[PDB]
Amino acid sequence: MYYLVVNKQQNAFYEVLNMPNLNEDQRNAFIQSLKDDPSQSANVLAEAQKLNDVQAPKA
């Protein structure tokens, strides 16, 4: 909230969300993962791309 996040974290939020394929549970922990640290925020977004697709059957 103050010294637990700064830069990246925000950019990772949109990624966490990425596409409609997801936006349910994955981000519940990912969104929180951001707030915990921006250094790892790249992880949340990094996976945000895999998670969204992890359950994306359609093209």
Domains and CATH numbers, the chain: 1-59 (1.20.5.420)
Angle at 49 between CA 11 and CA 21, to 5 degrees: 105
Q: What is the DSSP letter of 48?
A: H
Give me the helix-helix angle, 9-17 and 41-54, nearest 10°.
Answer: 10
Q: Which amino acid is at 57?
A: P
CA 4 to chain CA centroid, nearest Å: 16
Method of determination is: NMR
Record the tokens describing residue 7, joined without a space: 């830069």
Query: Are the CB atoms for 12 and 48 separated by under 8 Å?
Result: yes
